[PDB]
Design an enzyme around this catalytic site. Structure first.
Site: not given
Length: 164
Positions: A54, A62, A101, A112, A121, A125
């Site tokens: 991704r 990612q 996650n 990522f 985030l 994360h």
């Protein structure tokens, strides 16, 4: 004293370049150790040969799903999932390495590389490293991504390991 790991990137088999990462073993030792061990493959499984499934330009790259190659797999050296270790470090800009996650305490192997400041985030994360060399190679990878994240070419980690 903090480990440096490297990834050699290939685009449809052809070498692109090398990206190395400083892992913050001093602040997030358990999370840093998981990435380090999956990069050397010393536990018998790891990132070598896996793809970045991704890539969204202006946001992140990612990867880390070495079992299903699409975002639905992967596992840590501690088992299927492990806890959020802490949230000391923030998503302060491009180059940040952070765990993907699926909810609290669901860290596996996916991660990522931020190519932008992603402040939303923070606290969700776990940040555990940053690009030390080869940010230009991460910028080259982004140009193979798209708005929905599908890559126009196969981006793989042809080789990886520890530099220090």
């Amino acid at each position: 004293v903090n480990p440096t790991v490297f990834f050699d990137i290939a685009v449809d088999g052809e070498p692109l370049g090398r990206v190395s990462f400083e892992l913050f073993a001093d602040k997030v030792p358990k999370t840093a150790e998981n990435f380090r061990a999956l990069s050397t493959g010393e536990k018998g499984f790891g990132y070598k040969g896996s793809c970045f499934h991704r890539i969204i330009p202006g946001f992140m790259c990612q990867g880390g799903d070495f079992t299903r190659h699409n975002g639905t797999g992967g596992k840590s050296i501690y088992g299927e999932k492990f806890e959020d270790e802490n949230f000391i470090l923030k998503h302060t800009g491009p180059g940040i390495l952070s765990m993907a996650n699926a909810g609290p305490n669901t860290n596996g192997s996916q991660f990522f590389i931020c190519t932008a400041k992603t402040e939303w985030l923070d606290g969700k994360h776990v940040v555990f490293g940053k690009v030390k060399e080869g940010m230009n190679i991460v910028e080259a990878m982004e140009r193979f991504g798209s708005r929905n994240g599908k890559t126009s070419k196969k981006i793989t980690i042809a080789d990886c390991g520890q530099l220090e």
